[PDB]
Amino acid sequence: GLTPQELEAYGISDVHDIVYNPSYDLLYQEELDPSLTGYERGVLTNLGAVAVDTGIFTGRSPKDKYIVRDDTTRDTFWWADKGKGKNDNKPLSPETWQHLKGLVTRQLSGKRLFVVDAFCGANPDTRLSVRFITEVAWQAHFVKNMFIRPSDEELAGFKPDFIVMNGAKCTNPQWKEQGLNSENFVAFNLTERMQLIGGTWYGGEMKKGMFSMMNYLLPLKGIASMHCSANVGEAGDVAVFFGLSGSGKTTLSTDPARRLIGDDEHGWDDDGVFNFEGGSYAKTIKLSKEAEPEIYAAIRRDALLENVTVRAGGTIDFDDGSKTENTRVSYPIYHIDNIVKPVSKAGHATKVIFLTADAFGVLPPVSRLTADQTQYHFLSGFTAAAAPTPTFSACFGAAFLSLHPTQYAEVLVKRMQAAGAQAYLVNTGWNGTGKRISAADTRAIIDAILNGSLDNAETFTLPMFNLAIPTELPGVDTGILDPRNTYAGWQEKAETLAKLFIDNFDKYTDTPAGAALVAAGPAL
């Protein structure tokens, strides 16, 4: 356990009472305290889980995200104002940092505090020790679910590498004079190793804040940091899946014959692939027991519902998206049966799958990527909607990148090469006309990848993009393998898309890495 004196080292004073690493039993009682008001208030649902409301703080606040620019980060961070920018990594002065830090420590002074020590990363040799301090019980509950809970033995020798202080109740009145976006703030200081949260009550800021920090620390050590889901087969073969909204990442990574390592954040070190998290933060709009039985069943006592509509009686209305469509629920990973246990990690990945939804109808259902193409497409992070509106998210998670995108690509292929892994580009999209690709076909494609069939298969190249397409695939109509067969014609569309890729990639050509990669992209 820790003493009040330990917290005063951070600037907090007059510490009334500390509840260190509270059990789920205690948190449940705390959340239901009738004296709580506003966003602190918790309500019991018919499913047994507690539900909370974060007001207008429905999602992340990229505009209020700042990182202190100093000797530590000056030359290493991917700044929003240097070179070509193109990101939310806005620099902050050390003096303003001390002011923001002071606002939080003063807000937390003279209160009963909740302190949660946890780990980020499932592999002991490469994990990060994090201490979270909050004055709100459900916030302590959120971090207990989302990060790895230490054993009493691990707690004995705990020494935090990073400290996050949640001061949602305070705001910065001097914001205007300081040249900030608003009175709220999500700030990071890599020299003092701390994260501050002010004004915003959105739980995801704690999850995504640590992800951004891991994205900085790990690649520097030669450890891949990835925004993906990962699962394992009976033979211990592991696959990682990358894909933005609509790509079907989650659904395709759900397989009764394959245990889940994790659904969102993973690292890849000398020992293999590991989950950063100890829980899942799932979206709940239109959630049905029929479509998502695993998630639905995870919602019980100890899970924490966020912003969902609950009626006086009858309770949860998962369909009500009037307030927001970003309704969430967090729960410890063990609420899911089909997982890798007792530790969320496995061996080296041998199959890397990039999922996309090409509404332009140009890309093939499946292509086997070359090492350079893997890097090119990882950096592009393409997907399109409504058909078509294209989206390019670097490394399939641009908003959480702390280093130049090329750095993530380099470490990824380094680990892939050491494992002899193979990458595939799978297009589950439709241009809006004629017969679309069926879920059955999509599953057949994934099976062919996972079982090693496409690994040494004969292929033919697709013009311009130069993608290698397998000659035939078991359980799939050979006809659908060639995207041209759906239609000048395809060529005209291919030129349009190729131009988009080229236009987007110019953002990284300044670096020797990005520059060298241009030759792996579309040739028009």
Residues designated catalytic: 60, 208, 227, 245, 249-250, 264, 328
Task: Tell me the two tokens of residue 411.
Answer: 């470490």
- DSSP secondary structure, 16-54, as one string: -EEEES--HHHHHHHHT-TT--GGG--EE-TTS-EEE--
Among residues 90, 83, 141, the alpha carbon closest in space to that of 116 is found at: 141
SS3 of residue 77 by DSSP: coil
Q: Which residue has the tokens 């450890």?
A: 223
Kind and range of the H or E run holding 317: strand 316-317
Output the CA torsion sign for 241, 247, 249, 254: negative
DSSP 94-142: HHHHHHHHHHHHHHHTTSEEEEEEEEESSSGGG-EEEEEEESSHHHHHH
User: CA of 61: how far to CAs of 64, 82, 114, 183, 198, in Å?
Assistant: 5, 22, 24, 12, 11
Q: How far lies 499's CA from each of 290, 378, 515, in Å?
A: 42, 18, 17
> Please, which residues have CB within 8 angstroms of residue 45's CB and are 6 or more apart in sequence?
51, 305, 310, 315, 316
The CA-CA-CA angle for residues 202, 336, 299, to 5°, reads 50
b/e per residue 462-500 (b: at least 16 CB within 10 A): bebbebbbbeebeebeeebbebeebeeebeebbeebbeb
**For residue 319, how far is the Cα from the chain centroid?**
24
**Which residue's structure tokens are 């399109």?**
384
Distances in whole angstroms, Cα of residue 281 to Cα of each of 373, 439, 499:
32, 25, 37
Distance of CA 224 to the CA centre of its chain: 14
Q: Residue 340 is which amino acid?
A: V
Q: What whole-number distance in Å separates Cα of residue 506 and Cα of residue 327?
A: 36
- Selection from 336, 337, 369 nearest residue 352 by Cα: 369
CA distance 160 to 130: 5
Closest CA to 348 of 424, 412, 419: 419
Distance CA 278, CA 341 (A): 11
Burial class (CB in 10 A: 0-12, 13-18, 19+), 5: exposed
SS3 category, 166: strand
Whether residue 454 contacts residue 444, with contact meaning beta carbons closer than 8 Å, is answered with no
Phi (first) and psi of residue 309, to 5 degrees:
-85, 125
